[model samples]
Every structure is written in C-alpha cells, then in structure tokens.
Target chain A: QGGPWTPAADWRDAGTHLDLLLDVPGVDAGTLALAEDGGQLTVSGERPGTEHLLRSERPSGRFVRELAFPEPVRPASGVASLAGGVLTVRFEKLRPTIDVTA
Target chain B: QGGPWTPAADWRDAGTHLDLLLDVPGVDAGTLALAEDGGQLTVSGERPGTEHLLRSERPSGRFVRELAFPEPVRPASGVASLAGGVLTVRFEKLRPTIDVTA
Candidate 1:
C-alpha cells in the first residue's frame, strides 16, 4: 500500500514478550498509534514524505503494521516508542498456566 | 516500479551540492548501487524480505532513487554513506561563471 512501505525489521523472540526493533527512517516524533482486537494487532502512523516523488527512497505516507498474534493477547500489554527515527514496539502474549488444585 | 518503492526523503540544497537523506529500512551495506547518466542520478539496492509477505510493512526487496539535476553536474563529484540505517547521498553541480576583468 502507498500507505506504508515494506521496510525490513529486526525481530527477537523472548520468553514472555516479542521484541521488534524497526529501523525505519523519517518517522515522526509523535505520529504513532497501536491498537489490539480479535487476537490481532495493528500499528499505524505517518511519516513526512518529500515533495518530489522522483527523489525519494523511503515510501512516505502511513506507517502500517497489521499483525495477527498467534497466541491470545490482552490489551494494556503493549508499549511503543519512537526514538531517533526508529520505532520500537513490544507486546506480551497472554499465557495461562494450569494449577491442579485437589 | 516494484523494482523500487516510492520512499520518502529529506532533500537539502547546498551552495555546491545537493544532499539527500533516505529513511528506508533493511537496506544492506553491500546492496547499494549508484550511477549517473544524462544528467540523472540513480540509486538502488536490495534488502532481505520476510518469508510471510503478509507480515511486512516496509516493502522489502529493492531500494531505488532517480533524480535529475537542474544545473550542470560534474561526474565523479558525488559522496555517499550509510549510517544508523540512513543513506546520505550528495552530488556536486558543475560550477562555471564568466570572470569579467574590470
């Protein structure tokens, strides 16, 4: 989508949380949005694009990440921040442990 | 062209050169290529793509930038560098002025 470009990201899997370090440039300082529903996670934002279309290398318009969580996830368990033009997003997977109580 | 995405860029005009900062992610240190012809500058590269295309935001694959110079540009007068996942490219426009002896 002209809305977002396919910029590669560095993915890391932890025991409890999934850590993603995205190295996309030209992202804004305050245009980040995150929402969760129906076991799906969506991240959308906007970055400044150049005036001349012929002189651009990074797609500029919207920052979109429509990712579906394999494991069940709960709200209020996500953290997102934009630093130095890089956006770091983290999510916690809902884990339920069975406690056998006789 | 899928060969290159319409990425965003911050353009700068200096007295002797034109500078551009590209914010595309996943661009490799080895995949960058630059060339000039017919007063046009072209930059292109490739980045690793995710196995699941359904899970990507930044269109991964190739990096491209095609620009034309309004003023005369001299060959071998360009400098480029990639740092912190940002590619900075510059070009020197050919300068010539008639000297009037008073």
Candidate 2:
C-alpha cells in the first residue's frame, strides 16, 4: 500500500527538452536505463532482501511499475539516482523536424 | 543539487522492526538491497534513463547515496520499491539474546 504523498514537477525549455522530477522515499542507489521504441519510458530494478529476527511489517512482494510520457523523449541523456532515499530522473525532449515544399 | 523537499517517516513496532518511508521524486521501479554488517545498513540502486530531443536540462552525473542506522538492524527482511516516484524500505530489528549460566 502507498504510504504518503510526494511532490512532482514537469520541466520544459526552449530546446523542447522536458525534465521530470518524481519525489520518492526508500529508494537506494540504482541505475536508470531509458529506451525509445514505442515512445514509452520503462523503469525497473531488483530489491535486495535483508535478514531480521522480528519482522513487524514486511512488503508483500517485489515492487515494480512503469510510467508513460505524453510525447517522445530522448534516452541518451536520461539519468536517475537515490540520495537520502530520494530518486531523481532527468531527460532531454525530442522535437520533430519540419520541412517546407514548393 | 536537490530539486524539492519530500516528507519522511520512521516506524517501529513491538517486533523491534524498523520501517522507514522516505518521500522522493524521479525514482522509477528499482530494487532495494540492504546489507547489515558492522552494525550498519547500506542501500543502493540504479536509475533508468529515457530518450528525448531538443536538449534543455540534464543531470550533471549519476546519483548515489548511503545512510547508516543508529543501531544494528537485520537486513534479510528489508524490502524496497518505487510507486509514483516514492521509495519505501522496511527492516526488522535484531534483538540481542541473553543466556543464563549455572
């Protein structure tokens, strides 16, 4: 079950690049791999298990989820991380080129 | 550099288990691996990248961070995840057992 609510923001500039920040907790150091196929961004990782004498509360199972973007995004410059339990993701936006015909 | 402020909470029950919820953003689906040794807990993971065009903003470098527990905690039961960009970690506490001798 979800614990609390965190702030999020969508960023875009003159270059057509869009940056997204999703505030979260309990995330450790991990890698962010982005691929452009169906104009979608998929994030996934493995959660390590730990030992305990008494487990008051335990996660029911493994955690996984996917987020879709409104438009196509560039994966080359995408990056992510977890610091003090915060995960940050940044990426560049893709702009379609146009041509004029006589 | 940090983006925004997120909420966090620490939980403890009769089982001496510690459940920590750190609210963050930009955290995608990843694993939470915990190692308990020398009376410390370490969390790490990788962030996935996304494709985009018209570059505007970019993360300077990869993200990584570590946190230490005040007391020794069991890692075997630790679990982590990212939901809507929030990471949650739960760990059981290790209680030292005492033996009586005649």
Candidate 3:
C-alpha cells in the first residue's frame, strides 16, 4: 500500500460556477464514484495494478478525496468529466436570497 | 504555488524491457522533455494554469522526475507514449556482456 491514495486537486470559482480539477492517472473513468453530501464532495476510484513492479513512487490501490466547498452549491446541477487523467467537476453556485416585506 | 510538483511514478521489469509509468495530468504531451544521461532518465513538463483559483491542493506549475536504473539500458532503444494521462517509457535492457579471450 502506498499510504492513503489522496489525489491532488484544485478548486476554482468561475463566476457562475464552481470548478474542481483532480489529478487521477491510471484510473478508469467509468469506475469513478462521485458523491455529494451536504456541503462536501467525495470522489473515490482505483488505479489499475501493474505486475513485476520494481519501484513504486506512484500511489497504488484505491484513492479518495473529500472536499468541502467555501460556498454552498447546487448539488443536483453538478456535472463531471474526465479527460487525459484529470477530472473536472462543475457546479452551479447557490444564488443569494434577498429578504422582502410582504 | 503548491510545493514541488513531483509526478508519481512506477518502475517495472518486464523481462527484456524496463518500463516506467508516470502520472502527469494537466500537462500537455507535446511540451514534455525527456532525456537520458549515463544511467539516469529525466522527465520535465508543466501543467496548464487556471484563472481565479481559490484553493490549490494540487501541485501547480512545473514537474520533474529523475530516475536511476538498477541496470544499464539502451538509450536509443527506448520509446515513449502518452495515453489517458499516463506516460509510458519502454527501454530495452542492455544485454549481459560475455567475457571472451582472444
């Protein structure tokens, strides 16, 4: 085991949407499991194993990265895509509410 | 900047070949520079930048991974390919020298 497989990630505020970019090489895109709970986002996946490994500077086994957003996001409106080993998650930020007298 | 960008890697002995697999997401394949000197191999590249980044847990900027092989390899016989965010380098191990008396 190569410690806890914690993939590196970045969070960005792109005006109308919140974007997260994660590095996950060797992981099959179809096997990724992304879950959103409350204000947190959890991503879990496993990299394919290699045989006759001599040196392992790369992380092995399963990986998981749980992130909490600075601002609330619309969970149902989130979309994700994986390309060239990077996973991009885009979510619509919850709009601000204004108080009005009836 | 999020610390030094040391891409994760693995070295494997595949019989007559020495294989190295490196994880490098966000980096352009065409921008990679790979070189071999003596018994070492060096790979250098840069990951693309993002605007309006809020939290940067991922390693940013450039990355370099230098590896020394346990055995000598044929530099000219090495070939590299990048797919799905993983860079694979395959090198033919130098054949064992046989002692011959004149």
Candidate 4:
C-alpha cells in the first residue's frame, strides 16, 4: 500500500506511474493532494463519513500515507479522479528543459 | 468496488487499465485469476487465514467479485502481484491483427 510515486527513470519505464485506487463506499467524495517538499511526494486524503454504516470493512478514520519518489519529479501538475467508489491519482514524469547551443 | 478492465478506446485513453489494491493483513499470499466466458473479467483470489485477529474491522469471508470489460482482453497473459497487503492485477488491451493484401 506504500511505494514510490515517481518513476525510477523515464515515464516509459515500468512502475514509473502512480496508480492508486481506493475502494471506499457510501462516502460522497475525497481529495488527493501532492505537495513538493525536499523532492518528496505525499499522497493523502479523507472521505466524508455517512450516518449509517451499510457494510463496515475497516475502521473509519483519516487516511494518510507518504511515498518517496525514486527520482526527482515536477510536482506542479498531477491528475486525480473518483468514480464508482475508486479514487485514482496519477503522477506524470516531468521533462526538464535543456539549454540549446546556437 | 466494481468497474471495467479494458480501455474504452485505445490504451492511451484513461480508465483503460486495471489497478486492484487489497489491504488484508496476515494474508500470506493470494491468487488472481481471470476467466473469459461472456467477455467478462473475473478477479478472484484467496489468502491463508490467520488464527489471531489483531483488529476485527469487518467480517471475514471468501472474497469474490465479477467485473465486465468494455473491450475484449487476453485472459491468458494477465499479470498479478501481492505485496504489503496490497494485490494488484493489471489487464492490458488486446490488439487484433488484420490481414493485408498488396
């Protein structure tokens, strides 16, 4: 459940992309935030609780986890979505601009 | 909790991949199998049950689920893995070869 987010090499490499799917039912929605500090990517969120518990699987509490990137990545932009009680957050690899010689 | 496996369009499109993560503590290992009968993808597996229950969050029973795929996929060559209480099964899109004539 815990691993690196950014790819070890380029985006083409396996395990380079982040695929997170949370199976939480009866909750309205949740959020996934990625903060850049010391080149570490932290993915965390919380789902709103409901009054009644239909089928309780795990304890209802704040869900949080930190994942270190194997390589440095540009954390300015990321993708997140929630559908059918599954939350997927993907972090793409950032290509650094190179200086051109005239 | 329930969704399709194959991509709606090509592999480039979103929601075309299968990412399953199960957090089951004390589960030594599990198996994931996909059967093709009505173009449906069935991801089922079982883990060795432990006697001691550290935390009883939900009722323990045989886990099972049937998911339908928007497109046909190759069931024989799928990939599966279980690590750190997380099980992921990824099903890639199958491309049909076309016969060409000069």
Top-lDDT structure, candidate number: 3
Give the lDDT of residue B2 in candidate 1: 20
Docking class of 2: incorrect
Off by over 4 Å in 1: A1-24, A27-72, A79-86, A95-102, B1-4, B9-11, B51-55, B96-102
Candidate 4 residue-wise lDDT, B1-102, digit = tens: 122222111111113343333333223343545455556656554433322222222223345655555545666655666543334455655754333549
lDDT tens readout by residue for model 1, A1-102? 123564445444444665455655765656767787776667776666554332444566776776666556556787876654456677675773333559
Models, CA RMSD each: 8.0, 11.8, 6.7, 17.9
TM-scores for all candidates? 0.56, 0.38, 0.88, 0.34
Query: Per-residue CA lDDT of candidate 3, range B1-102, in tens?
Result: 465678888887777888888888878777898888878999999887766688887776788878898668986777899887899999888963333559
TM-score of chain A of 1: 0.67
Candidate 3's C-alpha lDDT? 0.81
Q: Model 4, clash count?
A: 1
Q: Model 4 segments beyond 4 Å from truth?
A: A1-102, B1-25, B30-34, B47-55, B95-102
Task: Output the worst ten-in-a-row residue range by lDDT, candidate 1 chain A.
Answer: A49-58
| True interface contacts retained by model 1 | 0.18
Comparing 1 with 4 on lDDT, the higher-scoring candidate is 1
Question: What ordering of candidates by DockQ runs from best to worst?
Answer: 3, 1, 2, 4
lDDT of 4 at A52: 26
Model 2 chain B worst lDDT run, 10 consecutive residues: B53-62
lDDT of 1 by residue, B43-92 (tens): 78876654322133345577677876656667878798875456777777
